[PDB]
Symmetry: D3
């Protein structure tokens, strides 16, 4: 297992999150949390035809259409830590009103706000 | 009013062939729809400035993968290739979409890409 | 039982967007074919709180988001026969670009086009 | 700009409450996402008059049910009401959605509407 | 009136918590919709037996995980355990949904399952 | 490796379909058909607490809501190849009328009739 890789990536971009993710790694599926590391960030993110800042944004776009609040929220921090400004994080959620529709955009934005706001 | 153009020099630049293709619903119903495209989509959203055009045609593809919108997919694949995006890139966002939107979605879109990636090869 | 209370409704609005779907279907799996007759038109449509011409529009709305192409066409012919103007039909597909995105509406109108032009 | 007022005309009479809550996001995201609704949504789409505003309200409802959006559906049930739509009519569109969108969707929309209905 | 009682019978017998819930939303509205769930959903389509009882319960959980219906998902898990579905089984189907619907759908569902496994 | 497992199931249950690898080959997305064999099959379908016939049957349910036609078809084969009867396969789609609506069920049955008619 070269699962050590996906980890080398998580601990420097979204460590607090995956750490909390394992707070599911216990009476349920720790195998799931496992997979979200050797295949998610260690087999897809590992490669690189696209910067890390970009990939985190593309994820935002996907999570906005799906309306996946919690997962989306988690990825906003990921993007910030990665090197994205709040300006970018929102310009993509606005572009989403065009393809996913307005409610989808409205929701994703309200969501990234929370993440933004709780630094105090 | 007229800003239509503010978003058209864009359209007529990247995916002209496309806007044209849709002006062909100019009858079956409201040109009014093709109007709102250039006039709102490209009029006020794409024109904005914080993300490069290349970066936007790449962010449009992702969403369209999840929605499985086949037609609109092939379209922006041209539009993306046009702004400078390479194969390796278009196909990278799709592969990445298997993780978030499911394998059936990343596969369905790649195939639609493989098609567009064929103009005058034969 | 009152299977007719259903079929004695579907035989009006959409006589082939049914006759047919009781064939490329009820040739191998007829639990579904009855249910649609019995439950949808039998128990649900037969309700009367909203105009017939309204119920057809709301369905056209529903299928737009879902990208239900085939069932959409079938429900366009039915909106027409119910007495809806092409104008009205096209309207709902426009209002859908807002709450469900542009690709949804662009894809739905293209489908209404076909049905609109079925005979040369 | 009779393309802001225009939509805003519709807005500050029908959906008086949650629009105001567009200032409730006026800080994070440019007033743009809150502007586009007024501008585009209600000034370029709802402004058209081939469909009664009432008919237009039940429509957004149909779509928002399928999308499982809860916030937007909640605030549009407030509008639906204000534009004249009776409770019985609202609920009706969602009973209709169980057939096209499925029971989980329909049940989910009616519970959220109950909130707007239970004393707001 | 016929199938209505059949539907309610089943609901009561194996998901009493969801039974009562139907009584607490039958009021706002639908005796008509709460009717249809009792009448059509359970005593008309669920009571069909071409598929093992267990199987007919995992499918419901597969479907709900993809639609992200966190509400209906906790309720059906309850009725899944009631049908003899082991906790191992419930989690397995959700882990599999990660492949056909995406990681966010599974993670979301599993976490939902977690709340239920903690009476 | 692992992928040796994935295939152990693929070339068994649904080989005729999985050989769509041929289609990703032209460097479009080959790397993709690999993840399918070594993750979808090598890491998930392999850890079988659930019977295969039930796993495939579940994929059918999932692909029915998603309205994934070109995919539903491939798994109906994969399902029949595991012993699933036709009447059984149409069953999961009938139930889906309740959870995903009549339009999704009808769209899955027709797709299935196609593969039942090869």
């Amino acid at each position: 297992e070269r699962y050590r890789r996906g980890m080398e990536i998580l601990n420097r971009m979204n460590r607090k999150s995956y750490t909390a993710i394992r707070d599911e790694l216990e009476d349920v599926a720790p195998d799931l949390a496992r997979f979200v590391a050797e295949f998610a960030y260690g087999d897809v993110y590992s490669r690189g035809v696209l910067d890390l800042k970009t990939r985190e944004l593309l994820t935002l776009a996907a999570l906005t259409v799906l309306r996946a609040d919690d997962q989306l929220k988690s990825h906003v921090r990921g993007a910030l830590n990665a090197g994205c400004s709040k300006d970018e994080i929102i310009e993509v959620m606005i572009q989403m009103a065009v393809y996913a529709g307005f409610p989808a955009a409205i929701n994703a934005v309200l969501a990234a706000k929370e993440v933004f706001t709780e630094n105090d």
